[PDB]
């Protein structure tokens, strides 16, 4: 239900309503953390 509709490329984390792209890793705010993806 928590639907994200933005992605942000940056070296510092963006707002939690977006995904976090940084040089080979993407991260989304899950369980009060930025959960990487494998």
């Amino acid at each position: 239900m928590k639907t994200l509709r933005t992605l942000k490329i940056s070296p510092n984390a963006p707002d939690i309503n977006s995904v976090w792209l940084y040089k080979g890793t993407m991260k989304y705010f899950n369980n009060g953390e930025w959960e990487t993806i494998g």
């Binding site: 933005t6 942000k8 963006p14 707002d15 309503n17 977006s18």
Partner: protein
């Protein structure tokens, strides 16, 4: 402000232009001058050449 989306309808960063190279002829550009912070805090600008 990931919550919002800045509509070009309202900001008009890209607006229409009469021309002869085209009929849908555009023009871009915008500038931020103010910032309205909570509790009535309003910061305008006055650019002085002395500076």
């Amino acid at each position: 402000w990931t919550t919002f989306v800045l509509d070009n309808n309202s900001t008009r960063v890209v607006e229409k232009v009469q021309s002869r190279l085209h009929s849908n002829a555009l023009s871009a550009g915008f500038q931020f001058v103010e910032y309205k912070a909570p509790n009535g805090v309003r910061v305008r600008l006055d650019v002085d050449p002395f500076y």
